[PDB]
Amino acid sequence: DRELKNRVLGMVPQATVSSTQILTDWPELVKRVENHPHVTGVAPFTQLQGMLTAQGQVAGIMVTGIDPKYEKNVSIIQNHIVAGSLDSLKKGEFGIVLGKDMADSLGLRLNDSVTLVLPEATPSPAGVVPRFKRFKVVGIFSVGAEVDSMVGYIALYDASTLLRLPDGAQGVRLKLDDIFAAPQVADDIVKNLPSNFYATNWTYTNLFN
Amino acid sequence: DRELKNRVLGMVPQATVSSTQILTDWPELVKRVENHPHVTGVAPFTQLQGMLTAQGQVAGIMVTGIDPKYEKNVSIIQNHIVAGSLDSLKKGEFGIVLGKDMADSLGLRLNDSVTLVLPEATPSGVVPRFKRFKVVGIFSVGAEVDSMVGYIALYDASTLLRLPDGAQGVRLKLDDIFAAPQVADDIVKNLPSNFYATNWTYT
Amino acid sequence: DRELKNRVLGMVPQATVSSTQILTDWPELVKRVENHPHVTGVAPFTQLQGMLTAQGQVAGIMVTGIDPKYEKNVSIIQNHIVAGSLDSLKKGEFGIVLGKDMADSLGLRLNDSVTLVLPPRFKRFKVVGIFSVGAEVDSMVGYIALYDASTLLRLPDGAQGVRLKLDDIFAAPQVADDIVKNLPSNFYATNWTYTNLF
Amino acid sequence: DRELKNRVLGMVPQATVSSTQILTDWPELVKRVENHPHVTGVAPFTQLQGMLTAQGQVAGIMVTGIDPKYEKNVSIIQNHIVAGSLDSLKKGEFGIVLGKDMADSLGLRLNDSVTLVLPEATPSPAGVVPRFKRFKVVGIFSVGAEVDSMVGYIALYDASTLLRLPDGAQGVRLKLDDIFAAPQVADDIVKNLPSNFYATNWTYT
């Protein structure tokens, strides 16, 4: 199945060069990384974990802040948009692009409201102070059973604004000519970066303790 | 301020004897622990962390499953009920008792619906489990507890955890809070390895 | 480099059928899954995370309890043994097989003592094997006997789940989900496409 | 026994005003907080969790960076020094003050070396990557069974150096005339502080 490989491989972050500090200079990291050997695509990202809620329903979700103009270089989500468009993800508009199954679970259609809730630790007995922000559905995708029910996309700078941070990115995502070269490439790139940077790759994965 | 002291000290779990395995036999643990020297009150508990949501609002909360017939021996919450009653917390009714500030923040009044959300860790990251509850009581003690803590039926707590009827542990009230470390450690010393002690001096 | 692929791909768990309850019946789970379409290898596993310490050095480690007779059906670690043997991983002996870089970081050689630290709980092991695969895994993972893993957890002899090797890694999400669909609620699927929160 | 109560209560952090950002300006926070009603003592602190290693032994430890001149206003550890001195905790000298039980478990005496290990998170399956620093035992205290085996003290600015941070404090610890005023006071102080500050108090279990 040639399409299955592109569906699975298109959704896996092959490698990232990430930072513990928000990168307002992320486009210089893109230019610095794009010409590294084996790199065929680069895009900024910020990875958030939270819940969506609407009309009494709650669903877990992993939200990635993206720039759609770059995201085409690493993703296939733009090829599987069933309603709306990724290009509606703009700073300050607080649109969100959801998977078809996720949107169905919450009774959501295009242009419907949905609340994004992010947990935030606190030493108080409550344990969490949730930060919640209202979003509008501007896109719906349909890729695969797993991804359709767990992941959503928002504007890159709405992701940082939700974090009370300046406009920037957590890191850049890499697409490669050989996914099995992802460990070496990310390790090599990080070697010449300052200590705030670190590498991830798709081989990083379920503890019983 | 003697009133301030009782409100603050009345809400502190002075010591617990807790278990990593659900205790379906907890009433015998209560009578056995209640007779220990310096112990003046014992009550079962199961402590949950989650969020409440209603009408688009969400708040973090620490929920304790309790048995009201026992809970008055260790707590002062029964002395500060402003509406409803702790005695409405019975198994299977899925009532909840909230602080006045928390209820107002969610626009909740007595007998209103509110959804409790508990996060479950997912390898894929949270598959939240949510359940509708009914506000059956409202208390008013202090600014912190009124906005952070709630109470449900002991066996509703274990049912939310998909467990048999039981308790996570028992809370102890003592004649002298500075005796809390010794008493809890003494009790746990002769219990099997699933038991452990906590006390208020470890934060 | 076809060898680079074999080193990288050989070390990733492509799919698992795991359980929130230790599986004392894991060989029955193996027989049920090994003939599933696309499945070319099955082995039990139990995954623990902790630290190793020896002579004042400390390293984080991901520990997998394994049965070497099965593990060769899913792994390539047996092809890169530099010292000792995976066959020394037997119940109750508390051997451990380490990567070369981690062993160096702790100043460990064959038959040396090393202490495992789990959330602190301590248990001493004996180095019975050393492997050399690739830079990352050589410094991060170790293997112990399956039932020593469950013993550390104060559990009866069993496995956390079974690891699958497939003819097509891109079938892993579908294959693992299909297997788990008719299993009771304690079972759940994982696959390599599960991957860094800000 | 009033000695037991003074030992237990003297070791409880009644309240803190802490920050998610290292406080290089912490002394102004002290002066700003010390005259708040009910406050009888303020001291900077930085809280570290790690392990100690010496002579083949390993022990978990909660390490607090302190400034001894201030810490005497909030602590009783200075009243139970059995060996050495807290005044030897100075920046860049990397002394440590240990409880007697911890020292006995590692076979440590005064001026012996001991290694502090801090587990730093990493996304790799290794989970942690340890950071190591050699310390010298410059003091030993004996208060009670729990703290003597779990808590140690280092210089404030040595703690921030271990964290690869500039000289500063994680927060200030408050001592009050009435411990039951601690929740209200710390919450009141934080209300007039920017959003990087948060309060803790001893009722947090």
UniProtKB/TrEMBL annotation, chain A:
Coiled coil segments of this chain: none
Cellular compartment(s): Cell membrane
Every MacB-like periplasmic core domain range: 1-190
Family listed: Belongs to the ABC-4 integral membrane protein family. LolC/E subfamily.
Protein name: ABC-type transport system
Gene from which the chain derives: lolC
From-to range in the entire protein, with total length: 67 to 277 of 426
TrEMBL record, chain C:
Gene transcribed to yield this protein: lolC
Similarity comment: family membership: Belongs to the ABC-4 integral membrane protein family. LolC/E subfamily.
Residues of the full protein shown: 67 to 276 of 426
Subcellular compartments: Cell membrane
Protein name: ABC-type transport system
MacB-like periplasmic core domain mapped to chain residues: 1-180
Lineage of source species: Bacteria, Pseudomonadati, Pseudomonadota, Gammaproteobacteria, Moraxellales
